[PDB]
């Protein structure tokens, strides 16, 4: 049979089918089929055409995405999409009136709009344009301007700045509608004193002078953005007077120094919760604020504050977890690290500071998925004690011992990694199995957890793959100091334990990372194993996630130590297994994985022949404040400067004489600045070490344009094949 | 025997000795030996100590260079040297009184001085600090501030901006003292509307945020700097009132549009010549301006104005040539292209517009070296009709038939490439032979052109090289269309014509370039031939210099055409010779050579297996106005935009699928911006071509720091050895 080739990976020859649905009520969902939008009845599976595909070709522009208003009366059409950072972008928007069957051409949403969202009920709109918030009560009516302070690179109303987008909210939006749309809450960021990262952008060859891009970006220890929080009543807006936004200030325990706003969650129509985090990220406070009809303001009762702190590390996996409120808003459930360091669900009364754990054990709750008056639904890695598996469970709120696994036994050989999507009041749920077999999407009814139907089983892909020599995946563990550490191996087809294969260690190894799991993937590793007969291994060592704080917090204030040593030890253990050619072990990684790859290659271990670092961090003072300081503290003599100075790639330059290294970086990387690799290369040149390099003009952290993505994987494949003494092949052109 | 290795090249194991002297009169010169400065009598060769190496033992700073005042009374000590561009730098200066044995401690030259020069006689000083000119009449006395308009990156008084430094004057200074030091002439450049090139500078690893460097740099067709010219009388300066500078305006034929000041040459104590060039560089005007004692003004009479134009190309090799005036300033000699397109010496009377050619032939005069009362001394490539040779000649002013070759027959097998250094009134001259044998420095008397003595013969290097398997050099020509085109080959030791060797074509090929010559060099090519047994060839095709305008102007308005095609043809002709392995032909070059290498690799010729481009130009709109427009005109639809768009490397990207390419560039290149290689790589990625790259953090066009220089040649050697399958 044929193998899974590099061209198969780069041209997406073998495509994974999805079943992306959008719940619109407790019994119906929308699903896009052959460019038409269909509405499905969950109980019976029958459908009706909601919006014909022809409608999308009526405007003359190509439509990037759509958003139907919750009441189904309007459709927001997104076009002229222009990407900014990981989540941010600008676009033009048109609104189509579904009952009048006509495009709205008056009081349009402006071009270069930064963010738009419908209210959660009805059809109000809030949008951000030129860093200011606007609200439209009706799609054809003039907007009400909420803020007047917006200023490019300085004041951000209702949108995040660079560091809040990447590191705090994982979103460009900083707008939160109340459940029924009466109130609009928003954050305002002030970057006045934040230094700018500056880099060249070359653009099309017609551009005679390169542009200098300047982005407010706080590097470790630098001046951070400041934040304010406001709530506006959208039902009392006037065309005669400016809108009154009510400020909610941070608690004084936060105002004493630098801090962040890290979570916004509405509890009821008149109650909002906010979580704040100190700049030293081991102390956070939740405020619960109620609307006061007598003053028109928001009161955050001091008696309702909840403190969450950590003595061994930072708070949360990446940030404090979100609360899930009961309907009355008087209690909530939240994932918290317990006394043993395992993340479990805790039940709180809004006026009481001691919470009660409702789950326990040497495993962790990943997320709370739905909450009804009778049950709480959650995803955990409890099943078979496999940290890299995921299953859906339900717990009776009247008896915590009554826990049922909803997904564990549905198809145990094919499905060990689930996510879920519940209908509006959780009468139904879609289960999404992503491995170890081909992804499988199914629909279920909550009343008795009855399976209704299979939505997508990837039978088309299965038929195609029967004719390909596909690799296999092994997930297992090694024991180090009486602790299990998990690894995975992508094994070549017809794997023979009596033969010696070359091995590539694929690394991430950042705090809370997980690279050993049960997910089915078709990626570069699939080609390396299928066509090139390379074993591609990954290992989750100290600092990795979902296995408790004793493992995750092991690298607290000490990045570039145990997680680096544990990758080296894993490669030694893989050599001890007997089917690995110890003369052909390589390592590669991107981002944090590029940093770890570089630290490993500079260790002088003698284990690795070669390695590739893509967009690596090289020195923690070059990376952003929020992520870096979470694990490293501040780069000051009084805090952790000594470790910042001891954990650079540059200090290990002399040891690179022992290895073959390929260093790759996009010149327009706004995230891990090209500076980081420019300093690695300069250090290697300064000690006389030869190495290979590749810059990618105008590519960012993703090196994700169609042509650059094909080019980088082609270049890396040649490098690994040459390191491993694997043959080349001529092609006509 | 051992070979000449890469470490020998990088560590300078085998050193070429020089003999750098400084003439102080018509009979004596200074020579630095064992840090002592000696004064030599040219006639007899005896010496005396001028300044002992112990004088400045307690100075407290490492001295970079020195400059003795023309009257020998003072010495300027340069220290704290900080490089800027190719020529520019700043430094600190101390003045030491050689008679009193005292360092000047008051009214010192400021730190961060941009330029300093003694007057040509005596000991006045002019300097530029913070873009303004200052004059000191005596080293211990306060300075007179001449200009008050200087402003970083905007107004430059007495110093050049980036483009005038690189492309017009080949110097940072823009100050010209009159012969006896009475007047100080200077240019002022105004870069207000010139766009800025911006690039990152990463600095030491301790720098948390990269710096953005911003330099006023006009790319092709962009707004250029403007220029003004002034003359100040330094004998009538006052501590009470500000100095009066007299402006000399450009002629109306220049003021009608954009133009450049391209030459300043004093003719007498009261007469200065200026040459101006239109932005379309095929028309130049020389004004001869006289001081008017009655008005205090400088007048340039049209009766003494001379035009120089070209109908086939630009004016001059790189710019209009310098005039050499007779002592009375009533006539001058200048190299001009003749009716046949060969550059020869023309004699002009200041008020007569038709000049008389004093030399002629199918060869060219390279430079006028000295003009005495009876003879003119010049360097040419006449000898044996070899364009890549250089010899010194003299011609009698009253009889152009009385020519003597002064260097041709001295040592004809060892020496075919000379330069010269004459004493103050040319009674003596030092000849400097740079090849084809080991360099040889000798001293001569011009009384009857008799040799006095050998100054340095490199016998120490010769003894060391006898134990090394050194390569040889062949210089010859091929005939194409009844025209000779010259090439050179660096041949491996024990070269066997019956065997096939890999070949590397080392390219420059820019307008007026010459890569085939008789110079002896110890460089990367020496290692490739000596250790790796690679033939390193270079070829001078259309557009090359010193062979007349029919060859040089062949690429006018058409860069990236004939000079590219002729490198490909040369490699085909080298294959036709029989000792070349046609499966192992590579090409490399730096700067314009990187552009030609890239254009050749993108040609689809199938001749070359691999190549390396270092800091290449990729598209002429990215390079500076003065150099680019000289050959290309303006990038406008009405002028030459179509050819600017047709001559890019990016347009050839698909053809790179046929070759192995290594692209290298310094990130802080202020000259050929990193942008140029960033656009090549993006075009190759866009068509799915694999290639090799290397950036050099914070390196400029020279990639010349000790560590980066060693790294780039090591990386390139690995690449060529892998291309040629050499262990
Ligand atoms: C290289 O060697 C050259 C040859 O010796 C050096 O030239 C000589 O320089 C000295 C000093 O400048 C000259 O000295 C005296 O010259 C006359 C007398 O000249 C007669 O006698 C000389 C031998 O003693 C002969 O060489 C002459 O040809 C001639 O017959 C004196 O009258 C001078 O006296 C005056 O100056 C001195 C100070 O220098 C005072 O002390 C006296 O009181 C008086 O005022 C000189 O003593 C010498 O003439 C000259 N010889 C030449 C050129 O032939 C040359 O300097 C040296 N170069 C270097 C760099 O080392
Ligand atoms: N910039 C940080 C990351 C990075 C890149 C480059 C160098 C170093 C590090 C990239 C993103 C990633 O996000 C984790 C997701 C968190 C999340 C999201 C939603 C809800 C809860 C948590 C972590 C590593
Ligand atoms: N920037 C132009 C040059 C260049 C670099 C990079 C890309 C393209 C081109 C470099 C310098 C060089 O100068 C020649 C010398 C002229 C001269 C000097 C003194 C007196 C008379 C003539 C020509 C090519
Ligand atoms: C599905 O069928 C029922 C009748 O059994 C009907 O009421 C419902 O509207 C249908 N839904 C869709 C989306 O077609
Ligand atoms: C958006 O831009 C287009 C193109 O310039 C313009 O025609 C249109 O009117 C703009 N729309 C709005 C809402 O301003
Ligand atoms: C932003 O912060 C700066 C201080 O860094 C302050 O001067 C300015 O008033 C603030 N602007 C707003 C709109 O809050
Ligand atoms: C609203 O605020 C803006 C900005 O401060 C101001 O220009 C405008 O006049 C205000 N409008 C009213 C109606 O007060
Ligand atoms: C939405 O909530 C607000 C605040 O309690 C309330 O005044 C309003 O009536 C609610 N809307 C509806 C439709 O009940
Ligand atoms: C938070 O971290 C700092 C730095 O390690 C430490 O001084 C402080 O005590 C920690 N706080 C808690 C709650 O442990
Ligand atoms: C130059 O700088 C040094 C060091 O600061 C200082 O001592 C000296 O006085 C300065 N010279 C002048 C002329 O200002
Ligand atoms: C420099 O030129 C600008 C116009 O480009 C002009 O405004 C300015 O006055 C000039 N400055 C001097 C000192 O000549
Ligand atoms: C000289 O010119 C400068 C700059 O215009 C001025 O400040 C100074 O007063 C002038 N001095 C005299 C004496 O005129
Ligand atoms: C220098 O030349 C000028 C101009 O002719 C003259 O006035 C001056 O006196 C000359 N100086 C000497 C020392 O002869
Ligand atoms: C100078 O060059 C331009 C452009 O080629 C041309 O129009 C003009 O005629 C030239 N002048 C001469 C004297 O050839
Ligand atoms: C030789 O002449 C031919 C015919 O005109 C031309 O195509 C070719 O470019 C010339 N080659 C040279 C001058 O090297």
XYZ file of N, CA and C in Angstrom, chain A residues 587-589 594 597-598 601 610-616 656 659-665 684 690-696 712 714-720 722, chain B residues 692-693 695:
126
model
N 15.621 16.034 18.414
C 14.624 16.715 19.228
C 14.136 17.957 18.492
N 12.834 18.252 18.591
C 12.357 19.489 17.971
C 11.193 20.054 18.744
N 10.983 21.344 18.578
C 9.828 21.967 19.211
C 9.666 23.396 18.727
N 10.593 25.118 21.511
C 11.840 25.565 20.884
C 12.858 25.945 21.942
N 13.987 22.579 23.445
C 14.884 21.929 22.461
C 16.275 22.571 22.517
N 16.324 23.911 22.513
C 17.600 24.648 22.521
C 18.372 24.400 23.824
N 19.728 20.832 23.593
C 20.872 20.775 22.680
C 22.109 21.440 23.242
N 20.947 15.899 16.767
C 20.505 17.123 16.102
C 19.196 17.593 16.660
N 18.830 18.822 16.306
C 17.521 19.299 16.736
C 17.130 20.566 16.012
N 15.843 20.878 16.068
C 15.279 22.044 15.389
C 14.496 22.865 16.399
N 14.773 24.178 16.482
C 14.002 25.074 17.352
C 13.271 26.053 16.451
N 11.934 26.087 16.576
C 11.136 27.007 15.770
C 10.593 28.092 16.703
N 10.828 29.369 16.367
C 10.395 30.534 17.153
C 10.599 30.340 18.669
N 11.829 29.970 19.086
C 12.041 29.707 20.504
C 12.132 30.948 21.357
N 26.822 23.796 21.837
C 26.236 23.503 20.533
C 27.278 22.974 19.531
N 26.450 19.324 18.464
C 25.191 18.942 17.807
C 24.984 19.675 16.489
N 24.038 19.164 15.679
C 23.607 19.833 14.447
C 22.306 20.565 14.828
N 22.249 21.889 14.633
C 21.110 22.690 15.044
C 20.531 23.462 13.891
N 19.190 23.494 13.824
C 18.483 24.309 12.830
C 17.585 25.266 13.619
N 17.784 26.572 13.412
C 17.061 27.644 14.126
C 16.183 28.379 13.117
N 14.879 28.457 13.402
C 13.923 29.033 12.447
C 13.063 30.060 13.136
N 12.784 31.196 12.466
C 11.935 32.206 13.126
C 11.296 33.114 12.080
N 25.974 32.035 19.200
C 26.635 30.911 18.524
C 27.773 31.421 17.631
N 29.075 26.362 14.215
C 28.318 26.369 12.974
C 26.926 25.805 13.252
N 25.939 26.334 12.530
C 24.547 25.878 12.687
C 23.810 26.270 11.414
N 22.555 25.812 11.276
C 21.723 26.121 10.099
C 20.601 27.050 10.543
N 20.183 27.950 9.637
C 19.154 28.899 10.013
C 18.168 29.098 8.905
N 16.987 29.611 9.279
C 16.031 30.005 8.256
C 15.144 31.087 8.854
N 15.080 32.273 8.204
C 14.111 33.265 8.651
C 12.917 33.130 7.684
N 11.726 33.562 8.126
C 10.525 33.593 7.270
C 10.033 35.017 7.227
N 8.314 25.495 5.520
C 8.976 25.137 6.765
C 8.989 23.614 6.965
N 8.795 21.300 4.656
C 9.691 20.732 3.642
C 11.165 20.894 4.112
N 11.526 22.104 4.591
C 12.911 22.384 5.025
C 13.293 21.497 6.228
N 12.365 21.395 7.199
C 12.621 20.585 8.388
C 12.740 19.105 8.020
N 11.901 18.633 7.060
C 11.964 17.219 6.646
C 13.332 16.929 6.039
N 13.857 17.834 5.184
C 15.187 17.590 4.600
C 16.244 17.501 5.716
N 16.160 18.415 6.708
C 17.122 18.450 7.809
C 17.095 17.151 8.630
N 15.914 16.680 9.006
C 15.803 15.447 9.805
C 16.283 14.245 8.986
N 18.487 14.167 6.569
C 19.947 14.188 6.453
C 20.607 13.775 7.788
N 18.875 27.545 1.289
C 19.623 27.670 2.546
C 19.753 29.144 2.882
N 19.710 29.495 4.179
C 19.832 30.918 4.542
C 20.673 31.095 5.754
N 21.187 34.562 8.499
C 21.222 36.007 8.805
C 22.399 36.174 9.779
